[model samples]
Structure formats: structure tokens, C-alpha cells
Target: MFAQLVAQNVLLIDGPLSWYSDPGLLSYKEDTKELVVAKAGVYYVFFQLELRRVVEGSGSVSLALHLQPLRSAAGAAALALTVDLPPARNSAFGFQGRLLHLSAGQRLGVHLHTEARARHAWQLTQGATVLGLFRVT
Candidate 1:
């Protein structure tokens, strides 16, 4: 269930923090949770996010990153991943990809949802190495 990034704000950062194509720029707000490459593998799947404003107290935005398939790039398909995030206070949360494997030319975007209204989405790109595909065999 892999899809290509047609023309969305989705970016492929790489290198230390660039998972798609931009790294060390702090573009995803200073409070972005970096999903460090753990097992050195490829995770092939489409991902989206539903985010809320950064809460004043916890300093985080309630967000959910989902990885699923699409029909014509706009339609939703089965098989996806839903990640629930708490309000982040300028801290990066760690993510461990279990069995998901991805290849080249793939894309992932993040959405911002505040007050229950979903707004525009974004894909971070700082390093040029968006998603990796390699695991311990």
C-alpha cells in the first residue's frame, strides 16, 4: 500500500533528522518529535497527521499520524497506521517502526488540526533522506 507524493507540502527529510529531504533546519517547529532510525530498514506506507494547536500547559499539540493506502491519491484505502501524540513541549518523541517497510520515492505528510477543524498538511524535508528501508534479518 505505497503511494507517491504528487504535489503536497509533504517533504522527504533525511540525515540525522531529515527523513525526507531536509535536515537540521528545525522546520518542523522546535518541538518536532524525531523518529530516529532504529533498525535501519525500509517502511513502505502512506502517512497523514491530524494535529491540534500546541497546548499552553504541556507545550504540545495533540496529533495523530496515520499510514494508509489511497485509491487515486485522494481516496482512502485499507491498511494504515494511526499514531496518537500528546502535547509536545519543545521535545522530540521517539518512534519505533515495528514491521513497516518502505522504498524510495515514497512520501509522508503531517496535518494540523485545531479545534476539531483539520487544516493544511505538511511533510518535513531537511536532510534529503526521507524514509529508510532496512531491518535486521
Candidate 2:
């Protein structure tokens, strides 16, 4: 019985790997912006941001991958996670994992935030490129 109950619960994802800026975080206000995973499998999440592409700035910037889990009880609003990341002088952020055995109609979302208003550049991406997003079956 315990195992059956636990399996019914949903898991969440979140994090920040950019703009070491404190306020840097992801937000999801609209329901259409969410990605629904139909089954339990490994999914790849990624984001792309370039300082030179965004703007001309002397200081460095941090990039992060923020995720929110959508609960069944709640309507469209999802709970945000407090996962934070510094900055990646390298140039990329990506991760893969299995989502809590989910069913259809379930939703997921991603967002990005910056610390300071600098001429910095950035774009959200999935897999490898900006705005790049994908899910597994």
C-alpha cells in the first residue's frame, strides 16, 4: 500500500546555473508554457546564454536551470524550487533524469532571472541550444 501511494505522487525539478545574481531564478505564470511528461523516463533539460550575444558588459554573469513541479491538487500554479547555481565560465548547462511516474495532463515549466541589469546576454534552451527543450517517453 505504501509503495502504491508513493508511486502516485509527482516529483519536481529546478535550479539556476547562470547570472550568479541572487534574484536570478525561473518563473512560470502561464499554463501553456509548461511541458507535460506523459510517462516516466529520462528527460534532458538545458539552457543557453551568452554575454557577448546579450550585451556588452565587463562583469561576469551566471546562468541557471530553474524547474517547477505541477501538482495535481493545484490548478495551474506550480511550486518553485530554491535550487541556485553560481556562474559557468565554461558556457552551458544540461541535465537528465526520470520524472516521477507521471500520467497525462501533468504539466512542467522553466524560467530564468538575472541578478543585476547589465548589458549581459542570455537565452533559455533545451538539450543544447537556447529555447531548446525536449522530453523522453
The candidate maximizing TM-score is: 2
User: lDDT by residue for model 1 over 1-137, one digit each (tens)?
Assistant: 22222112222221122223323221122234333332324544333332233322222222233332322665442233333333322222223233554323223333322231221222222221123223333
Off by over 4 Å in 1: 1-69, 72-92, 101-131, 135-137
Q: By TM-score, how accurate is candidate 2?
A: 0.35
Query: Please, what are the lDDT tens digits per residue for candidate 2 over residues 1-137?
Result: 00100011111112322121112112222324544444444444433433222322232233333333534544332222221223434233443332333344444444433443332343333213232333444
Residue-level lDDT for 7 in candidate 2:
10
User: For all candidates, what are the clash counts?
Assistant: 38, 18
| TM-scores for every candidate against the unseen true structure | 0.27, 0.35
Q: lDDT of candidate 2?
A: 0.31
What lDDT would each prediction earn against the true structure?
A: 0.29, 0.31
> Which candidate's lDDT is highest?
2
